[PDB]
Amino acid sequence: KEFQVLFVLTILTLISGTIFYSTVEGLRPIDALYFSVVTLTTVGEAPPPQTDFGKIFTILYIFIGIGLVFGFIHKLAVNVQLPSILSNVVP
Amino acid sequence: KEFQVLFVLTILTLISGTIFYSTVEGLRPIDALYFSVVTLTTVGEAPPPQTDFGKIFTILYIFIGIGLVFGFIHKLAVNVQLPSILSNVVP
Amino acid sequence: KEFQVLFVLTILTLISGTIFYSTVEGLRPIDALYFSVVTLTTVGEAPPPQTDFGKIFTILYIFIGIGLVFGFIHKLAVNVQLPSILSNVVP
Amino acid sequence: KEFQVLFVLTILTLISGTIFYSTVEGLRPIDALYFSVVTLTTVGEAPPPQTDFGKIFTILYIFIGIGLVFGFIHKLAVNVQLPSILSNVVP
Ligand SMILES: [K+]
Ligand SMILES: [K+]
Ligand SMILES: [K+]
């Protein structure tokens, strides 16, 4: 399914960021995963990377990841959350 | 109505975040509500949660809440703010 | 015109925020205007309001202003920037 | 191509921001480029400009650049990433 592919791609993208920021920025995996998530969702509740490699990766990560992550959120909202709500609203 | 449902769902989602961050992050409700709002709107004018539970909740909260909150803002703008303005612009 | 109305509405919304944050948060107008702009565009390159009134206003300001500001940016991009670019690309 | 023009325009916009913030805010080019990218993508993982000229430029830069950058990300996602994925999903 479209949703299943987007879900997996999003997980892989977030794992990749988790590995990158935990390695290069010396973050605990949960901090690395959190940073990846608030970066790609554009929430941005975190200070900037300290290293030039962190900054370069983040620049490329944003352009590569944001379209995928927002596609996933759009399909989540449209093909999972919306039918669920409709179903919850029928007496 | 569509707007009435989205409004309520948004309020429930924000109350849920308010309860969570006031409990786990030890925030005053207004700080907890503020954090919930700038998180789900992607404004992100706030430092990150201090606890791992805060970070995990925030990650899940973002993916679950963002589509709802942006749907609400879209319906607010399109079905409430726009007709109001049109009405204000007619002599 | 649609663009002219959205432009004015956006200016009024930003003036309103500029007045609010310069008064309540004690910001210089330019700081107040900057905060209003990065808040409503969801850029969020600024620490949170210090006062509870700042936080409450910001919460309401976001939901009320974001749809207008993004409508303006959409019309700017679509009805001004895009025709300009097309025109620049014709030999 | 539409994608080729949007790509170039985005690069020019980011170069322009890189030049501006490296000059006026005294940032190393990579910091200036990073700030330009997280500003225009609305990620906002960076403190505010220190100078009034930085703040004014950033205000104008956001309204002018955000529509272009999100148009580029939309065309990247829709006309490059989506066909690539479809192609990877066919047995
Ligand atoms: K954002
Ligand atoms: K931020
Ligand atoms: K942000």
Q: What are phi and psi of B25, to 5 degrees?
A: -90, -5
Alpha carbons C5 and B67: distance in angstroms, whole number: 28
Would you say D9 and D68 are in contact if contact means Cβ atoms under 8 Å apart? yes
Interface of D with C (CB under 8 A): 5, 9, 38-39, 42, 44, 46-48, 52, 55-56, 58-59, 62-64, 66-68, 70-71
CA distance B59 to chain A (A): 6
Q: How many CB atoms lie within 10 A of CB C4?
A: 9
Stated as kind and residue range, the H or E segment containing C89 is: none
Nearest to B51 by CA among B12, B18, B30, B22: B22
Question: DSSP character for C49?
Answer: P
Asked whether the beta carbons of C51 and C45 are under 8 A apart, the reply is: no
Domain layout of chain A by residue ranges: 1-91
The answer to whether the beta carbons of residues B62 and A40 sit under 8 Å apart is: no
What the block records as the tokens of D3 is 């994608």
CB B10 within 8 A of CB B68: yes
Helix (H) or strand (E) holding D40: helix D29-40
- Cα–Cα distance between B71 and B66 in angstroms, integer? 8
Resolution limit in angstroms?
A: 2.6
CB C80 within 8 A of CB B79: no
Breaks in chain A after (C-N > 2.5 angstroms): none
Give Cβ neighbours of residue C73 (< 8 Å, ≥ 6 apart). Answer: C41, D63, D66, D67
- C-interface mutation test, from D42, D45, D75, most C Cβ less than 10 A away: D42
Q: Which residues of D touch A46 (CB under 8 A)?
A: 45
CA distance A56 to A73: 25
Is the Cβ–Cβ distance between A15 and A88 less than 8 Å?
no
Q: How buried is C34 (Cβ within 10 angstroms: 0-12 exposed, 13-18 middle, 19+ buried)?
A: buried
Q: Residue with structure tokens 């020019």?
A: D12
What is the CATH architecture of C1-91?
Orthogonal Bundle (1.10)
Q: From C77, C85, C75, C80, select the one nearest C6 (Cα to Cα).
A: C75
Q: Dihedral through CA C69, CA B76, CA D43, CA A7, nearest 10?
A: -140
Q: What angle do CA B53, B58, B62 make, to 5 degrees?
A: 155
* Sequence-ordered list of residues with C-beta below 8 angstroms from that of A49, at least 6 positions apart, any chain: A21, A24, A25, A55, A57, A58, D45
Q: How far is the CA of D47 from the centre of ligand 2 (A)?
A: 7
For A61, B18, B70, B84, C48, the CA distances from B37, given in Å and listed in that order, are 25, 9, 11, 25, 12
DSSP-derived 3-state class of residue A27: coil
Distance between CA D50 and CA C11 in Å, rounded? 24
> How long is chain A?
91
- Alpha-carbon span A10 to D41, nearest angstrom: 18
Instruction: Quote the Cα angle for B31-D63-B32, to 5°.
Output: 5
Tokens 């962190």 belong to A54
D-chain residues near C41 (CB < 8 A): 42, 62-63, 66
Integer CA distances (angstroms), A48 to A22, A64, C66, D52, in order: 14, 18, 25, 22
The distance from CA C21 to its chain's CA centroid, rounded to whole angstroms, is 14
* Residue keyed to tokens 């989602």: B13
Query: Residue A8 gets which letter from DSSP?
Result: H
B29 CB neighbour count, 10 Å cutoff: 12
C-alpha A82/C-alpha A71 separation (Å) is 15
Do the beta carbons of residue B72 and residue B2 sit within 8 Å? no
Do A3 and A27 touch, CB atoms closer than 8 A? no
Nearest residue of A to residue B41, measured between CA atoms: A43
